[PDB]
Structures are given as structure tokens and as C-alpha cells.
Design a binder for this molecule. Structure first.
Ligand SMILES: COc1ccc2ccc([C@H](C)C(=O)SCCNC(=O)CCNC(=O)[C@@H](O)C(C)(C)COP(=O)(O)OP(=O)(O)OC[C@H]3O[C@@H](n4cnc5c(N)ncnc54)[C@H](O)[C@@H]3OP(=O)(O)O)cc2c1
Ligand SMILES: COc1ccc2ccc([C@H](C)C(=O)SCCNC(=O)CCNC(=O)[C@@H](O)C(C)(C)COP(=O)(O)OP(=O)(O)OC[C@H]3O[C@@H](n4cnc5c(N)ncnc54)[C@H](O)[C@@H]3OP(=O)(O)O)cc2c1
Lengths: 359, 359
């Protein structure tokens, strides 16, 4: 199995969102990932590409046999991932304490939104809920409108699965000294807060307000935002540094002497009006050509369906094809132990067959 | 130093955005993190809380002695982080090959937006540019308006720093059985693509469209969006599962028989108008009360300045007070080798001192 996590053994208690995304990435990087789903799901080969790089098995964990097979896998494995509410694994007899008895090397990885304790710890929720409580959601969107969710990118993945991965891998490093596993408690409300640590830093030194749409990086700055072009398509401008901004202005045909200063916030209305009219005078692909190879920090805003035609995407093999859709190749990349293309979702396997293969 | 990464040694070449954030999280979890900045940008103690859990040293990396001192640190370290354009460290004489001569065990971690090669590899850029190229930015915001940047959470951090971290830590795992370091190439355009793999998965199965504002998770769904309340503040609704959705409707006072089906997308505008009127009839705090302990997936949308007053935040110590104000505590959390509260930004210490300390 290709990639730097070759050798690593993972048991995933089938959940939704962050838990499977984390499991995917471990699989992506060479880990041997075994997913235990309930039989009343298992029903043909999955069409969910998030379930690549996996062996799937069936098992009623509420039964005594189910529980005991599960515990035979966990015994032989390096990592467990579960993303159920707190208390669920306990009551199945797969809690940390029960796992610690069959395998004290286990990294016991717990993926929740709210955490293991506290008033909200039993509330159902999704990404939008977890980022609503910690100030994030309120900061996303235009100022004249209600906040808009940044898909489920910030809570589920960036502040969720990815923190679970760091915890798992950090715990694996620790286990090199101590010879012992441990419990990783990854809550989306916490991960996503560390994810936005920059804003908390800026807020403390007066460089970020709580007003939505009035900061440097939320769309309030005329030089960090999207613009509509003549064809109704969009470009992105990210020209923070004065030298990049100057390069953008020159490409736009605007003399700096006619414009307000870049960071005179009081004249941002005028500046935005000027930039808006300039970008609106030609189509997206015009701007993309004008500014290619430039430090102007102007790029075309591509739709998913166009991404496969962008030279830089094609050339670095950011995507691969699988079953009527492109999918992202593993990230990040490794010089010596490269990851390989992901294996598609496979038909189910017997849990005994797995135990055999794992000795 | 507390945390699972006690005794990891990390040398950071100072840049902006993702490199510093990854360094921070390594520090947070107890790594020994030494950051080399340039003498000209450093006076007092840095007021950027992202520079917590670090020792800062200056060195003109363009001098012969700056370089020599630097290579001495790196020789004694486990990880090097650089976030410059490709070719920059090479010209300094700090490229992977120079480093591999003085320490074939080093994890050489390169944080870029566009990657190490390819047509865009020398272009300046920020978060908004990297997410414009791979379909992400186009998908974020309301349908009748231009895309809105999700701050810099998705490229810099979620698809940036966090992928650098997964790479550093996975390569440390690989090293334990190979005795060798290697190069980690973390490109924001790749990481953020894997970050959004769920949308690529859904798009392949006809469950996501490239139309903005028309999907389950982009704000198009009436049961996954924010709503304005009587007081002008917001709640988030995330009631995807029909049972949670039913619970929400009951607490709104809304008879499911009067309403269109939850997932009849052609009638979503009509459903939205009914939910809008209901949520608008009371203030945010009213709804927070009504739905506490509920699986209705309704939460108050708090601004940064209100987060310190939220019971669930306070009681889990998601934050600590520092500096000017609140900052996120380390994430994720560990049962045995627990992180400690971050150390504030250091005074710049002398690079020989460190070398003494590291032998
Ligand atoms: C509908 O389709 C899709 C598909 C994909 C989707 C992807 C993403 C999203 C959105 C953005 C999300 O936001 S993803 C984040 C959700 N939150 C959490 O993951 C945070 C922490 N967990 C929870 O809070 C969730 O569990 C919950 C909110 C989803 C609650 O769900 P429940 O259905 O109440 O499940 P519980 O976790 O509490 O209990 C699970 C029950 O199943 C039993 N048992 C598990 N495996 C079993 C097995 N193999 N055999 C037998 N039983 C099994 C457990 O024992 C337990 O049963 P009980 O408690 O009744 O004893 C949305 C998406 C939506
Ligand atoms: C202005 O204030 C803030 C503060 C905070 C900010 C936070 C976030 C952001 C936005 C959202 C971002 O998205 S952050 C991600 C940016 N992109 C990348 O990080 C991707 C990869 N790197 C790059 O592309 C960037 O380097 C660049 C786009 C910013 C390029 O800028 P350059 O300034 O040209 O820098 P280079 O990387 O090309 O080269 C740097 C030069 O510095 C020299 N030398 C470094 N350390 C030195 C030392 N100790 N001593 C002496 N010299 C040192 C190098 O040698 C190199 O020199 P040369 O000119 O010879 O090549 C924005 C934020 C903005």
C-alpha cells in the first residue's frame, strides 16, 4: 500500500461528515482502513466517493457477536474513529475504557461537534450549528444581509476532520515514546475556533470588527473580493500588498492618481465603484489572460464543471477521473513515499476475512 | 512542555498565513518551535497571538553567518516549515538538498498556494485566489449575488495549514520505520480540494449543482440556513434529518400538513417564506431558549464579542483570556498528554542560546 501511512491500521465506526472524511484521508495516505457499518445500511457498492480507500464490513454492534468481532478488530488496530454522540460507544461496550482493556496502544479518536461534556453535548447539530456558537458564521457574508454558510467546509472539515487527523497523528508520535495510546477529543466547536485564530488575533489588536462585510478579508476591502465581469462571470481579487495592487491597477487601465488610496477605508465606496466599473468592462477570460503570470492576484472564479479545463489544475494532477466525476487526488504530497490513486468503494467483506488478513 | 508533541523540534522560516498557523498548532501541542524572522521586521514583543508557543530569533538569511546559524538549527531539528515561493529557500542555500546534507532525518515542509511547479507556481496570491481556481469560491454565497469569500478559512487554514500538519505528522510516522525524512509539498489549491471532497462526491451522484444558492449545504435549503429574528439577530437552522426538521417545525408552531415537503426543491421559496415569518416573530434569545436540549438543530448565531458569555463555551474552556482578549485553547484535546495554556509571544532571543539548549 502506497504512501507515508503504509502499515497504519484503522477501524472506523461508520458515521457522517468529519469521521468519514478523516478516515478517507488516512486511507488516501496509505493507511489500512476498515469501516464497520450496520447491516441495515450495507446494500451494494457505495456510490459515495468519500468512502474510497476502505474495506467495508457489516456488524450489528448491539448484538453480542457484533460487539465481540468489533473488539477483535480494535484489538489488532492502531486507531479507532467514532463520531456518534457522547455515551454511544460506552453503551455499545466499545467505549475508551473497554478498548483500553483489549489494546492499550489504541488511539481512540472521538469526532463530535459540541464535545464530550457540557450543556449542548447531547444536542443534534450540523456544521452550521457548531460555527454559529463560536462567532464564525456571523462573520461570513455581505453586511446588508444575513450570514451565509461557507458550505460545511469550516466546521465539518477544516475545524473537524482535520483536527481529528492532527490529534490521531500527534498521538501516534506520542505513542513512540510511551508505548501507550490515548483518547483524542476532537470537537468542531474547538477545532473551528483554532481554525479562525487569526481573526481572534486581529480582533485583539483592533484590526477586525464584529461588523460583517467591513474587514480586510470578509469582502469589505475592494482589493479582497470578487467582481462581476462583462459576461456575468466573476474574478477574484486578492491584492493585499501594495505592489500587487499597483500591478492590478495597471492591468485594469486605472491610474493610481485618479483613485482614492488603497487603504483609505472612508473612501472604499468610491474605490469599489471604480474597480467595479473597470472589471465590468471585459469578460472573465479577458481578465484571466491579461493577468496570467502576474502578481496582480486576480484569478478567474471557476465553477466546479470548468475546473478540469484549467492548465494549472491539469498539470499538477490535482484531480483524477472516477465513475462520471472528477475527484481530488490525495493531499498533501510526499517526495519519497508518494500516495497512489485512491481505490474506489469496494463491495463488502466478511469481518472474519479481515481478522485473518490482520493475523 | 505539555502535550503529545513534547520533544518535537521545529524550525519555522517566518512567512504569513498558513505556515505560521501550522507552526502555532505544533507549538500548541507541545512542540519546540523556533521561528527565524529577519532583523528588520522585529521591535518589541510581537502583538500577533498567532506567534504564541514560539521562540523568535532573527537572522539575515542572506548573510553567510545567518545561513550558517540556520543550518545549525535545522541540523538539530525534526521539521522545517517554509512558506515562500518555490525556489526561494534553494537560493538561500536552505533548500531540501542542502538540509538533507546536514540532517537526512528532517521533515521538509513546504507551504504554498499553487504548488512547487506548474504555470501558476510563481504567481503571488492569497486564499481568495487559490479557492477561485478549484470551484470552491464559486459555490459560496447567495444565488443572486457575486461569490463571497469565507474569510481566509478554507485556503489558508482548512485546506492549507491543516494539510501541512497532516503531512508533517504523517511523515514523522513514516520516518519511525524508514529512518529518513522527506519533503512535504502542501499546496492550498490541493488541500482545499480534498477539503471539499464531499461536494465532488455529491456532484458525481447528481446531488450537487454548480448553481450557487441551490444546494443542501450552501444556504439554498430552507432547513440549512440562517434566519433573521425579531430583534435583527440571527439563528442558524441545520435540521437536515427529517426527525430533527419535524422537531424544529413543532417548536416554530408550524403544522407540517400546511407546509410543502421538506425536500421539494421547487417549493423551497415558499417553504422559506413560511419559516422566515415564523422565526421573525421572536428574538434570537427566545429561540435559543425554546430549542435548548432539542434535536431541532437551531442555534443562536453569536458575534465574536458574545462568545465569552455562552455557557457551553465557558464550561468547556474553548477559550482563555490573554493579551487584549480571548483566544482559542489548543485543539484537539488529549486524555493523557494534555496540552497546556499557550505561552504568549516571546521576546526575541539569541540564536546561539537556542543552539546551546539543543546541543
Ligand atoms: C442524512 O444523510 C446525510 C449524509 C451525509 C451528510 C454529511 C454531512 C452532513 C452535515 C453538515 C453534517 O453536519 S455531518 C456532522 C453531524 N454531526 C456529528 O457528527 C456530531 C456528533 N454526532 C452527532 O451528534 C450525530 O450522531 C447526529 C447528530 C447525526 C445524531 O444522530 P443519531 O442518528 O441520533 O445517532 P447517534 O450518534 O446519537 O446514535 C447512533 C445510533 O446508532 C447505533 N449504531 C451505530 N452503529 C451501529 C451498528 N453497526 N449496529 C447497530 N447500532 C449501531 C448506536 O448504537 C446509536 O443507537 P442508540 O443511541 O439509539 O442506542 C449531513 C449529512 C447527511
Ligand atoms: C501584509 O500583511 C499581512 C499579514 C498577515 C496576512 C495573513 C493572510 C493573508 C492572506 C489571506 C494570505 O492568503 S496568506 C497566504 C499568502 N500566500 C502564500 O503564502 C503562498 C506562498 N507564498 C507566496 O506566494 C508569498 O511568498 C507571497 C505571495 C506573499 C510572495 O511575496 P514575496 O514577498 O515576493 O516573498 P517571496 O516568498 O517571493 O520571497 C520572500 C523573500 O524574503 C527573503 N527572506 C525570507 N526570510 C528572510 C530572512 N530571514 N532574511 C533575509 N531575507 C529573507 C527571501 O530570501 C526572499 O527573497 P527573494 O526576494 O530573493 O526571492 C495576508 C496577510 C497579510
Amino acid at each position: 500500500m502506497a504512501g507515508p501511512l503504509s502499515g497504519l491500521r484503522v477501524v472506523e465506526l461508520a458515521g457522517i461528515g468529519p469521521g468519514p472524511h478523516a478516515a478517507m484521508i488516512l486511507g488516501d495516505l496509505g493507511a489500512d482502513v476498515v469501516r464497520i457499518d450496520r447491516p441495515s445500511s450495507v446494500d451494494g457498492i457505495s456510490r459515495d466517493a468519500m468512502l474510497r480507500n476502505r474495506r467495508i464490513v457489516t456488524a450489528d454492534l448491539k448484538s453480542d457477536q457484533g460487539l465481540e468481532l468489533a473488539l477483535k478488530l480494535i484489538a489488532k488496530a492502531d486507531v479507532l474513529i467514532e463520531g456518534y454522540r457522547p455515551g454511544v460507544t460506552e453503551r455499545l461496550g466499545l467505549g475508551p475504557e473497554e478498548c483500553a482493556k483489549v489494546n492499550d496502544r489504541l488511539i481512540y479518536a472521538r469526532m463530535t461537534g459540541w464535545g464530550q461534556t457540557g450543556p449542548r453535548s447531547q444536542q443534534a447539530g450540523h456544521d452550521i450549528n457548531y460555527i454559529s456558537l463560536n462567532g464564525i458564521l456571523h462573520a461570513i457574508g455581505r453586511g446588508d444581509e444575513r450570514p451565509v454558510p461557507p458550505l460545511n467546509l469550516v466546521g465539518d472539515f477544516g475545524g473537524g476532520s482535520m483536527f481529528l487527523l492532527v490529534g490521531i497523528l500527534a498521538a501516534l508520535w506520542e505513542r513512540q515514546s510511551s508505548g501507550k495510546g490515548q483518547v483524542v477529543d476532537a470537537a468542531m466547536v474547538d477545532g473551528s475556533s483554532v481554525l479562525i485564530q487569526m481573526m481572534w488575533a486581529m480582533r485583539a489588536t483592533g484590526m477586525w470588527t464584529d461588523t460583517r462585510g467591513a474587514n480586510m478579508l470578509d469582502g469589505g476591502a475592494p482589493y479582497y473580493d470578487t467582481y462581476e465581469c462583462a459576461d456575468g462571470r466573476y474574478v477574484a481579487v486578492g491584492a493585499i500588498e501594495p505592489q500587487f495592487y499597483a500591478a492590478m491597477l495597471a492591468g485594469l487601465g486605472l491610474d493610481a492618481a485618479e483613485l482614492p488610496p488603497q487603504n483609505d477605508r472612508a473612501r472604499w465606496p468610491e474605490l469599489r465603484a471604480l474597480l467595479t466599473e473597470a472589471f465590468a468592462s471585459h469578460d472573465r477570460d479577458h481578465w484571466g489572460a491579461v493577468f496570467a503570470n502576474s502578481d496582480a492576484c486576480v484569478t478567474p472564479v471557476l465553477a466546479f464543471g470548468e475546473v478540469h479545463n484549467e492548465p494549472h489544475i491539469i498539470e499538477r494532477n490535482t484531480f483524477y477521473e472516477a465513475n462520471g466525476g472528477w475527484q481530488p487526488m490525495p493531499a498533501p504530497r510526499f517526495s519519497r513515499t508518494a500516495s497512489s490513486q485512491p481505490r474506489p468503494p469496494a463491495a463488502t467483506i466478511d469481518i472474519e476475512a479481515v481478522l485473518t488478513d490482520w493475523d
